[PDB]
A paper describes a structure:
One of the most highly conserved sub-families are the SNX proteins with regulator of G-protein signalling (RGS) domains or SNX-RGS proteins.
Here we have also solved the structure of the human SNX25 RGS domain by X-ray crystallography in two crystal forms. We next investigated how similar the experimentally determined SNX25 RGS domain was to the predicted structure from the AlphaFold2 database. Side chain conformations in general were likewise closely aligned between the experimental and predicted structures. The predicted structures of the human SNX13 and SNX14 RGS domains from the AlphaFold2 database are generally similar to the experimental SNX25 RGS domain structure as expected, but with some notable differences. In general, the three domains have relatively low sequence homology, and this is reflected for example in a significantly longer α3-α4 extension in SNX13 compared to the other two proteins and.
Author numbering: 449 to 564
Write the structure that this text describes.
């Protein structure tokens, strides 16, 4: 019996969850979670590109993540180099709880979960 942690940890399972999110027309939430998981495990030399891609694909070219304005300053301050990339790790925890509480319960009754 798979749980949400098992879904995200297996790449096959996670691709099926992402397909579900595209059917819910909200694949930017899993994509942003996937981007910060890359940044968390990446070589130090790809970090600059990865951070700029996170702030452009999300927060600029798309506007689907829910931070509003309080933490948005922290993002800009991490892009310039004052603060660190820990702001993205906290936003990833908030997006994880969102996927877990309001999208995973719908996912476990779809065939993208039940046939795994
Ligand atoms: Zn990499």
């Amino acid at each position: 019996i798979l749980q949400f942690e098992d879904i995200l940890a297996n790449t096959f399972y996670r691709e099926h969850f992402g397909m579900y999110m595209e059917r819910m027309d909200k694949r930017a939430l899993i994509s942003f979670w996937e981007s910060v998981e890359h940044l968390k495990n990446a070589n130090k030399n790809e970090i600059p590109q990865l951070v700029g891609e996170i702030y452009q694909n999300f927060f600029v070219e798309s506007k689907e993540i829910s931070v509003e304005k309080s933490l948005y300053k922290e993002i800009q301050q991490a892009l310039v180099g004052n603060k660190g990339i820990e702001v993205f790790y906290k936003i990833q925890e908030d997006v994880y709880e969102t996927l877990k509480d309001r999208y995973y319960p719908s996912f476990i009754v779809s065939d993208l979960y039940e046939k795994l």
